Design a protein around this ligand. Structure first.
Ligand SMILES: Nc1nc2c(ncn2[C@@H]2O[C@H](COP(=O)(O)OP(=O)(O)OP(O)(O)=S)[C@@H](O)[C@H]2O)c(=O)[nH]1
Ligand SMILES: [Mg+2]
Length: 178
């Protein structure tokens, strides 16, 4: 069974690394902003065999016009944000929810907190202290997921691999049913 999925979220929130890890097992060395890209990977969930189309998108403003060209026949969407950056969570209902909600209504959305490893990182906590902030708490991410009627919230780390597999299984599970 074939299904298509699109990933979206702020700049450098880990969109790409996540998709590459899951389908190539390697963690990209050099960070290069994405214009657009396509990937494929297979997965078995609840006995079903599913081929997956992974459409990567850009989080940059400069590309707002072309990003909507990948939305056409989407089955499920992974709306991502970063745990070290509280603002990227704020921009969920601001920019991404409206954009997606327009182009792709009636399509399941999986809210995804990324860079789960940086929640404990000391360097991270110290830099955010200047800004009188702190990493995102699992609760607030779940609240945001409910607020926008997401199919489910999930967290993970593409660096350590913590929870990466569960993210896609939930996506596939949602792309089949509903
Ligand atoms: N600590 C940590 N760093 C990560 C993780 N995933 C990605 N990164 C790092 O964060 C930076 C952003 O990664 P990337 O996936 O390219 O962002 P993006 O959201 O796709 O960004 P764009 O293409 O919209 S500009 C990179 O330097 C990458 O190595 C993660 O799980 N943990
Ligand atoms: Mg990218």
């Amino acid at each position: 069974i074939r299904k298509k999925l699109v990933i979206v979220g702020d700049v450098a929130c880990g969109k790409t690394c996540l998709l590459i890890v899951f389908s190539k097992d390697q963690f990209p060395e050099v960070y290069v902003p994405t214009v657009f890209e396509n990937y494929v990977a297979d997965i078995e969930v609840d006995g079903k065999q599913v081929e997956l189309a992974l459409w990567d998108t850009a989080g940059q403003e400069d590309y707002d016009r072309l990003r909507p060209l990948s939305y056409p026949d989407t089955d499920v969407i992974l709306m991502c944000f970063s745990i070290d950056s509280p603002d990227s969570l704020e921009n969920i209902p601001e920019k991404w929810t409206p954009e997606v909600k327009h182009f792709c209504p009636n399509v399941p959305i999986i809210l995804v907190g990324n860079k789960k490893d940086l929640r404990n990182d000391e360097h991270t906590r110290r830099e955010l202290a200047k800004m009188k902030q702190e990493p995102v708490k699992p609760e607030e991410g779940r609240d945001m997921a409910n607020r926008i009627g997401a199919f489910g919230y999930m967290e993970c780390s593409a660096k350590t691999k913590d929870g990466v597999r569960e993210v896609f299984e939930m996506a596939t599970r949602a792309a089949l049913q509903a």
